[PDB]
Amino acid sequence: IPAHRGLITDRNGEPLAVSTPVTTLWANPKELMTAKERWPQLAAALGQDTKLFADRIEQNAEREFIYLVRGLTPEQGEGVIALKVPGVYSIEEFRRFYPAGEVVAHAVGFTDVDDRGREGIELAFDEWLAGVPGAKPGKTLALSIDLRLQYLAHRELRNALLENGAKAGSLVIMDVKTGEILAMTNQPTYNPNNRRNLQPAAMRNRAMIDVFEPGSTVKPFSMSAALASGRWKPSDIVDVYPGTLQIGRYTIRDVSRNSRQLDLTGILIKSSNVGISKIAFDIGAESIYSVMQQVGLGQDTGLGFPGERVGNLPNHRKWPKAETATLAYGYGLSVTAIQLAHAYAALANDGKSVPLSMTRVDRVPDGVQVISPEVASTVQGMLQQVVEAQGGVFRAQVPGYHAAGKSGTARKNAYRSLFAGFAPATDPRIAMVVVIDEPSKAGYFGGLVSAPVFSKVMAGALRLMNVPPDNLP
Ligand SMILES: *C(=O)[C@@H](NC(=O)/C(=N\OC(C)(C)C(=O)O)c1csc(N)n1)[C@@H]1N=C(C(=O)O)C(=C)CS1
């Protein structure tokens, strides 16, 4: 006797996964064998072919139990029952219905033929949701996801993917104060109510299971290590001329090569690999690795989603010069979009990392101070200048608010366009990561492709959360 599976809701109680009654029909072939004249009407009502159905019953004539069909609607099930065929019996089972469909398909996940979790929350909280067959019903679960922010993020990421002719994308929104995942969307997506088709690529929760090189989006962590060392201040200068730096057989290169002296904010604005590498040589890679490890890059999230990827943060006992530079500019590191969002949330939350949660958090757990508050506050200010200053990532500006962030562009020529940031700068509330895989139009830089999505989504999410606009006199 299958048990009723627990309702999944969003954080405000909107239904996301609902157990729906279905009819399963079984037969005692010993009794069905006494009513062969009824078989063709029964075959037609079950959908099945006349002769194939007849062959099936004859083959199981000595059995006392066989399944005829599973998961009919309790309309077609009543239609088979109205035939009054001897030996035909019914069992009430459950099939999930997902009211928001493709919009939250990767996060909510789905169930297999036996109504057991196969992907996402359905799989991760299967014990909680499943209950026990007879029969004790499963328990309700409220997610951290806010369906209003989810609809917005879904729409904007889909629109950006079409405008850039991209292969795939992910967008995660986090509450920096509580560790809650407020939205998590990917493209391509699928309709979890359509149990035919089922494209494995479209079902991938990319924000959690796909690893990527974060590139320039890790530079704020390298800078946090520089400021915490006691050796660097934002007004310090680094000479990046002539825009390249030879380290043995390896050549570090900047995209814009018309700089000489840059201050630390300028290094982030211009996204100078040479500048961040020179700072890394001075402070040592051990300090940078420790910040990136502590914010969770390439570390287990603790979420318990089977198949979730940990990625990799390279480590050494003695760091060679090339690896010191590449670590500092995010080359050769492998992270997930959830990890990158969580790292930006700790930075935004004055350096305190609050544990990640996919469920609504009522009592917030204690956070861990990973970056000193003063250092996190200084880096936040630099990231606000990255968005607001002359020559900055102007497309990440959020009209009405002070926003902060960092763009990234990774050469996989195929590219991945990134933007990670938070808002409002006066008292950060939300961190967001936008990852667009293989944009195919003229623009591929993170500040061109991903920054406008951050702006559109952040503009709506702050307003949906009634956050007061902070760009005031
Ligand atoms: C940060 O992401 C920087 N990106 C890189 O240096 C990488 N590649 O640079 C390009 C120009 C795309 C290349 O083809 O080599 C890179 C880092 S990890 C990886 N696999 N590739 C800088 N980021 C930006 C930005 O803000 O988006 C720039 C405009 C200058 S390069």
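^ acylated ceftazidime complex. The radius of gyration is 27 Å. The pocket of acylated ceftazidime is lined by residues 213, 215-216, 255, 271, 273, 330-331, 407-411, 415, 445-447 (CB under 6 Å).
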